[PDB]
Amino acid sequence: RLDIFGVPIDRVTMIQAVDILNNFLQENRLHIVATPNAEIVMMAQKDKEYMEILNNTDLNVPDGSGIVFASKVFKPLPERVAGFDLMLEFIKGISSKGVKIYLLGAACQVAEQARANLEKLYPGVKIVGTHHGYFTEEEENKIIEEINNKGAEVLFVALGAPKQEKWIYKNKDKLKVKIAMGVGGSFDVIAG
């Protein structure tokens, strides 16, 4: 772990991050995964709540070449671990074992379209549920109950930074998933 401007970044490779995520699936508790970049670290400077959340996440992966370039001053970061690429690699691995995934986030139809694209890419992928990221506080509890009841183990949150990390942290004791990871615009790129 190297603390880049208050935000702790885990000194892991793409392979190492993927292995950490699989190991997290063996523990029956929620693990918060975040992919900090230059924008995220800058957001943490002004936002004390956001920085507190980052300092409490299970894995902070070095998304973005900015952080990796800055780390060259320090034992620097081994490689750029992209959040989109990590999500796809982690999903690729876990489709063969049938781990229940839930997609929460983005505009209407984006999550169902990404689910369709991921099924075509990774045959045997178990995406147990989807919901858009434009829900209200009243709708929030019904989405949480849906995830919990559907038996979801991996939850990908595409609400954008800091919204995704803040949502996961606020509901950390309400969610019964093994991994909860902020993915941002990831659902938009795969759905098109």
Added chain:
Amino acid sequence: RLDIFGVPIDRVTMIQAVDILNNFLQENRLHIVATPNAEIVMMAQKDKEYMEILNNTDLNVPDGSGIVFASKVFKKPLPERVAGFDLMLEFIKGISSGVKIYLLGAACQVAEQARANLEKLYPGVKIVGTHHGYFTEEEENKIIEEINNKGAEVLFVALGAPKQEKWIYKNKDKLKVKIAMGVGGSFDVIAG
């Protein structure tokens, strides 16, 4: 107002920016709203025309953590990150309960999938018209006639920076709307 590398940035919070926009609706003249970030501020360095436009806009909101981090050097730094996408949604949220909105910009059907989405999110929202942002100089005057005749008060321009600010500025005396704001890729994220 902070002078970040020649570009004036308004020292406002999310709430303050929304209230400013609501008050702009009470003045019978066009108000140009821009959401500068590090990419925009850097564009202004080499583009004198663009920097002149940004020094002539009614409200420059600090979108992007870069500007907000840079402001930490000043005696009076910026209070928070006021994201352009988040501002556009919060403003629409308030005025939905019947201010006439027009969506101009993005590829074919994006502005229309955006409109349909905003109508589902904010019931009662009056989006009086939409047009794609890939129009010709001939088509330009028919769009401007459409906005003016349809009685639009708020105009969201999704042409990208600096294209959106330059389009608004060039047509500042041809448009009969109270607010004209550059929203870049806000239309694609809400449409999905």
Added chain:
Amino acid sequence: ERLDIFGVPIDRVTMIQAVDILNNFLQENRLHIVATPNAEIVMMAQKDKEYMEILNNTDLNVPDGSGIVFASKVFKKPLPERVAGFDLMLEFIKGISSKVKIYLLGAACQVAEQARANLEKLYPGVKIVGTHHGYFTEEEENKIIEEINNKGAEVLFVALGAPKQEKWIYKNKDKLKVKIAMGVGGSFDVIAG
């Protein structure tokens, strides 16, 4: 006439100049690799030796992104303007649309196809001979390359994202029979919508 911005060579060209360069590339019977470096790309090249080697071997590196253009202000001869990759791609197509077989490779399912339908409506006369998504397998790779070659494509726009797009073009540089091969990032997604 080239600026070494942190190991990555950037061509000191304007929007017009870049377009003319591309039009002249069409007169040479060999593949030309076009890349649009920005601060993210430039930074990716620092840790990725393979990627920096590719960027030092491309035919045209256009100044996409204000960061590079701002950094260049330090040099005796700075960069004249930003040459945005999306804007370059559209201006180039605009021209060649009246005359040139284009192939769109990249992005999610139906994105390249919707980008083709939109470019056909924007630039009437545009000859887009084929499209394919960018989530293909190594087995599917050769059928796409055969499709591009057999359909007689001259211009190939690769929307795979940096560094994936430049690495794909470079790895297949001697397998592709096109005159121009350019990394266009998320350009297909903005035009398709």
